Ligand SMILES: O=c1[nH]cnc2c1ncn2[C@@H]1O[C@H](COP(=O)(O)O)[C@@H](O)[C@H]1O
């Protein structure tokens with residue numbers, strides 16, 4: 493599809509759907525010998541709002557396909573604004589994130605929950621800007637790698653806009669300037 | 677169709693839901709053709725009522741994009757209080773922005789007894805939004821405890837305990853692709 497504010501398309505929703513199916517395939521095998529079951533010992537997807545909402549709805553669906561018992565958790569940051577509802581102490585957790593850049597965020601999340609003692613703590617990210625860490629972090633599961641660029645859609649946003657896009661696209665440079673200043 | 681041993685009968689498949697959401701999304705598109713909805717300035721604000729609307733929402737918002745409907749996505753989390761019969765729930769997460777002078781759309785998984793949905797509505801009505809409406813995937817008309825009509829309805833249903841595509845039984849089965857009826861031999 494083509495857009496007005498996109499400098500170029502990155503990941504079409506078809507390619508995306510494909511990369512997700514695949515990763516959930518890897519996830520599925522990796523916890524095979526883990527005695528995961530509904531109710532008692534399911535895979536706890538701790539998803540981070542609001543940028544992984546799309547990723548999480550599609551990926552959790554990728555996992556039912558591989559018959560993977562899962563628990564949905566939603567937490568928010570901006571600061572901790574919404575924490576987990578139920579405990580992850582003695583559970584396998586999957587911190588679902590949208591994109592790792594500086595990693596300053598996921599590192600914080602990881603340890604916090606790491607000090608929460610789950611049976612194991614792993615991370616899936618939809619998009620990963622490997623070339624920009626301000627600090628070391630390695631996602632366990634990665635759908636796609638992207639260069640240091642501002643991308644929107646598939647849940648991803650600029651000022652809480654362009655999230656509902658079906659595709660991952662690049663925000664035209666002369667569009668964020670064009671608004672960032674109208675802002676700041 | 678897929679198998680669901682824990683399910684006695686599938687109600688709706690992903691594709692049926694798809695067809696119904698898309699349909700609903702165009703209807704939302706004509707109804708707002710004239711309110712000059714625009715990004716940043718005056719989008720369609722989607723108030724997703726966690727945890728159940730998460731799947732509906734991800735899908736809903738895309739169909740709407742297809743119809744060029746600029747949507748602002750908001751997510752709210754709530755918790756029962758008991759203590760309550762008015763529909764009173766505790767706010768764990770509120771919207772990032774105000775809805776004042778805004779075209780707002782509450783997004784529920786299922787309207788049933790409607791106490792919560794009716795309660796949030798009243799909550800948000802008092803925040804002076806440009807307009808306030810609701811879309812619900814599922815609706816169990818009879819089951820009211822309070823009079824409540826939704827502005828959009830993906831599909832109607834009888835009083836079954838349903839599950840899937842967001843909807844849960846004791847935090848279970850929401851990850852499912854289709855909406856199915858939890859079989860009696862499981863409660
Ligand atoms: O290109 C981007 N598009 C959308 N959000 C981004 C982008 N880069 C960073 N972010 C947001 O920045 C948050 C923190 O990134 P990090 O802490 O540097 O890994 C992410 O969860 C994203 O929501």
Ligand SMILES: O=c1[nH]cnc2c1ncn2[C@@H]1O[C@H](COP(=O)(O)O)[C@@H](O)[C@H]1O
Nearest residue numbers: 787788789790791792836837838843844
């Ligand atoms: O048929 C159902 N299956 C699963 N959960 C349901 C069903 N009906 C209501 N719920 C849950 O209970 C909430 C209450 O809806 P209410 O009865 O209209 O207030 C819903 O949002 C769901 O989380």
